[PDB]
Amino acid sequence: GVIRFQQVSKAYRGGRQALQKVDFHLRRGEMAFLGGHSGAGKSTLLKLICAIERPTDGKISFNGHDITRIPNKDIPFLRRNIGIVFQDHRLLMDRSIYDNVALPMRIESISENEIKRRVSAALDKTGLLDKARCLPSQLSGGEQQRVGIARAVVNRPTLLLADEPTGNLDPELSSRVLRLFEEFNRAGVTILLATHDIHLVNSRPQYRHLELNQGFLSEV
């Protein structure tokens, strides 16, 4: 599958443990919510997926390739596949929106014309094409979050990880953001969402729900 865990567990330096015997399987095209409590281990699970922090007990398989002990030099090649959306909508206030959305395409050298066309297509898909030349500051919060999502997805990632994207938005815009994510899922991009809002997940029961309680994953 697009990601798998085999008896993976993690213990921090202090001795507090985020994840214990968590096991789940994800098939290409499926979407998951990964519900949990204020504590539990939702963020850590996302960090482990993209190799920001290494595990201790089990093994991680991305596409049949072990990520348990990936050498530090090969991490960037893995991260290029995975796109990440964070709650803080990390953006560079100095640069323009078009520059922020084009950073993943410039990390690997690409011709400027292709960058222009691809960024234009992505912003058109997210509806921010009009304000492509504006600074992030002038945008509203929802627009900044959509710019972040566009920057995450611009590079055709196989797996998209979102860490509470709707933290700083009222319920009205939550539906819009979740429908944008559903459109991306329809496109064929595997998505693993992460949130603690029970109402939002209960709204849509089509997608399988995994509950992470005190480091244990019922997967029901």
Binding site: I75, P104, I107, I110
Partner: protein, 203 residues
């Protein structure tokens, strides 16, 4: 997927890093001035030693002249080594400050999957430009000092009737000065930036 060529990306990086120095005029002009003066002292001292040695060659007397030459060489070497070390050290501090200024950009760049070389090359070229500009400024400073000193030397010579004038740095020496400047600007940048880049995390 079309990808830029090696020389193309390197040239673009050099051009963009040169443009970057002018983001902060106060931040990066003072360092250039300090490097210029620090690397100017060795050149000016060498100029004075060369001039006095040429005068001595132009002029019992043999024995003491060798001892005087030994003393002059020792003094010049000792005073120049300190400035070379100072130029090596000061460059590292400016690049450390620059890296800490671009903390968020490096975090986002590493998070997206950029290799370390991409993160590092701009700082190498910034250091190289620091070194080159410092060498050029030091050369100009030495020329200006020669111009200033020539008037007083002529006033002194009038009484002596020596009819002797100072001579500026040779062209071959200037190439070595520029080479030393770029060498320091590259080596200090590489060492400091490489050692400091490890301890910055994506999140």
């Amino acid at each position: 997927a079309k990808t830029d060529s090696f020389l193309a990306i390197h040239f673009k990086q050099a051009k963009a890093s040169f443009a970057a120095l002018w983001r902060r005029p106060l931040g990066n002009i003072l360092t250039l001035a300090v490097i210029s003066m620090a690397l100017a002292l060795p050149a000016s001292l060498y100029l004075l030693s060369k001039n006095i040695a040429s005068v001595a060659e132009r002029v019992d007397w043999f024995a003491r002249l060798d001892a005087i030459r030994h003393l002059a060489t020792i003094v010049v070497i000792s005073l120049s080594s300190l400035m070379l070390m100072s130029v090596f050290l000061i460059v590292g501090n400016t690049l450390r400050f620059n890296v800490q200024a671009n903390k968020e950009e490096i975090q986002t760049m590493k998070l997206i999957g950029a290799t370390d070389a991409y993160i590092l090359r701009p700082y190498l070229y910034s250091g190289m430009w620091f070194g080159l500009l410092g060498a050029v400024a030091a050369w100009l400073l030495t020329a200006l000092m020669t111009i200033l000193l020539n008037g007083a030397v002529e006033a002194l010579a009038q009484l002596y009737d020596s009819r002797f004038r100072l001579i500026g740095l040779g062209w071959d020496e200037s190439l070595l000065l520029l080479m030393l400047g770029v060498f320091l600007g590259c080596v200090a940048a590489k060492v400091s930036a490489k050692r400091h880049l490890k301890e910055i995390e994506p999140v």
